[PDB]
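Changelog entry: the 50S ribosomal protein L7Ae record was regenerated in this release. Current contents:
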Amino acid sequence: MAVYVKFKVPEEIQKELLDAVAKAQKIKKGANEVTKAVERGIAKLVIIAEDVKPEEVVAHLPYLCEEKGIPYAYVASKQDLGKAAGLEVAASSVAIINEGDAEELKVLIEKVNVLKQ
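Regenerated structure tokens:
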């Protein structure tokens, strides 16, 4: 398990995370765009895959999200995350900018907040 994975997200909540990405109205995909979205403060929540190699592609994201007050969590597979983001390829990370379901997003963020201590 990579040092960048700071807490373990139950598979059920990982599924909800992938679903939140899949129904989002606007997202950023991959480490470069996600990093910019967090720096800009426009990301509502950041999803990071646990199997990114090299780990340095996303290792800085947890610190950065915490430093910008932006919630983040994990899913097991960059391939699953890219497919949820509507891609034909993997995505190391995704930032939800404009979500599909505001209530669902709010509940998901709360659940994540509980996991991260």
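The chain has one domain: 1-117.
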